[PDB]
Every structure is written in structure tokens, then in C-alpha cells.
Amino acid sequence: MEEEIEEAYDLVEEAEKTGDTSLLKKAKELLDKVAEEATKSGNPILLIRVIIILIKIVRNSGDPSVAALARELLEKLEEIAEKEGNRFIEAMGEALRTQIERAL
Amino acid sequence: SMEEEIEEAYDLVEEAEKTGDTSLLKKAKELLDKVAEEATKSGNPILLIRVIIILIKIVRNSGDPSVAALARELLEKLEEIAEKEGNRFIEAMGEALRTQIERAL
Ligand SMILES: c1ccc2[nH]ccc2c1
């Protein structure tokens, strides 16, 4: 899913530079598919990548529903980190939680 | 080697904060000095991130300026890796950790 996540990041940047919201629509379709695979495989690193792009979207638009989705995925990430006993992923999750709130 | 030492450093900071024994913070910073140098040579961004996370924890519990100075030096090294690799996700994780450093008292 490396190709899709990098393309999604690219489209988020192009959408903000051009104002073409159809590109943000496409980016979000890519992000949904990556999120679905991350959640189905319990992959915290993929989730972190999705969350990072969602935060970018929230900075650019202030969309509360995108913020809500990012918070949803952060809870899922913290669940995986606690399940696996990885305190560092847990701390990253908390550092990203701060970034969501400051982006609103 | 490095991962074990990192886990021990994190453990010692938790033990220091649990007991109030600041000599364990000292030992953790010693371990982190050694690992920070190893992880910089490995080029492994995860290991750098783990070390920075523990340094942030120590700054909050002690305020030690030299600990914060090391965290900033490693955040610079982490950003160089991100640039070299074209990895915007490492860049974003570095920025998120830098916000935490800049908000310590
Ligand atoms: C991001 C942050 C911390 C981490 N610890 C192990 C993997 C990993 C990824």
C-alpha cells in the first residue's frame, strides 16, 4: 500500500495548491482503502501514515469530520500499541493527537 | 543491542518516576548517550524516534537542559534521514516530537 499512501499525500498537496476539491475526493478514497487494510491487518505503521495525511487535510480545511476520523484511527492505533506493549507507538499516538487538535 | 538498551532506558525512567530515585534518570541518560550514537550510525529512524521519545519523558520529569539539547540534535539527524529518503512521514513524526520538546517547561 506504499504506492497508494504516497499518491494520497501527493493529491492532498495538489488539491490545496490548486483548489481542485475533486483531487481531495480522490485522496480520501485512497486513504479509506489504506485505512481498511491497516485496520484489517492491525498494522500501526500504516495507521500512523494515514493519520499524518488526515492531519494535513484538517490543517487545510478545518473539516471537523476529517478530524473526527483521525481521532477514530488514533484510538485504533493506541489499541494496537497497548495490545503489543509498544510504549513508543503509544507515545507517537499522543504526539499526533496534539497535532490534530492544534490543526483545528 | 540497541533495542534492548532503549527498552532498559525507558524502564529506568519509569522506575525513577515511580520511586523518586533520580540516580536512575542519570543511568537512563547514560544509556541513551550510548544508544543515540549507535542509532545515528545505523541510520534507523525508528531507533532515533524511540530515543527522542524517552528524552522527552526525561525533560518533563527533570527539566534538564542537556537532555533537551540532545533531543534537538537527534531531531535534526532524524530530519536529515527523512530528507535523504524522501520520507514525508518521518518528517511529520519529527515535527510532532519537536512540538513536544518546545512545550516542555
Ligand atoms: C513509530 C514510532 C515509534 C515506533 N516504535 C516502533 C515502531 C514505531 C513507529
Author numbering:
A (entry chain B): 1 to 104
B (entry chain A): 0 to 104
According to the publication:
We reasoned that to enable systematic design of binders to convex protein target sites it would be necessary to generate scaffold sets with overall concave shapes. We focused on 5 helix bundle scaffolds with three helices forming the concave interface and two helices providing structural support. The selected 7476 scaffolds, which we refer to as 5HCS (5 helix concave scaffolds) throughout the remainder of the text, have a wide range of curvatures.
Programmed death-ligand 1 (PD-L1), is upregulated on many tumors, and interacts with PD-1 on T-cells to downregulate T-cell activation. We optimized the stronger binder, 5HCS_PDL1_0, by resampling the residues at the designed interface using ProteinMPNN15 followed by Alphafold28 filtering. The highest affinity binder, 5HCS_PDL1_1, which has 93.2% similarity with the sequence of 5HCS_PDL1_0, is expressed at high levels, very stable and has an affinity of 646 pM. We solved the high resolution crystal structure of 5HCS_PDL1_1. The crystal structure of 5HCS_PDL1_1 superimposes on the computational design model with a rmsd of 0.75 Å over 105 aligned Cα atoms (the substitutions which increase affinity relative to 5HCS_PDL1_0 do not alter the backbone structure). As with 5HCS_TGFBR2_1 and 5HCS_CTLA4_1, the interfacial helices H1, H3 and H5 of 5HCS_PDL1_1 have an overall concave shape. The key interactions between H1 and PD-L1 include aromatic packing of Y9 and Y123 on PD-L1 and electrostatic interactions between D10 and E13 with K124 and R125 on PD-L1. H3 binds to the hydrophobic pocket formed by Y56, M115, A121 and Y123. Residues Y9, E13, K56 and Q99 spanning the three helices satisfy the hydrogen bonding requirements of both the side chains and backbone of the PD-L1 edge beta strand (A121-R125) buried at the interface.
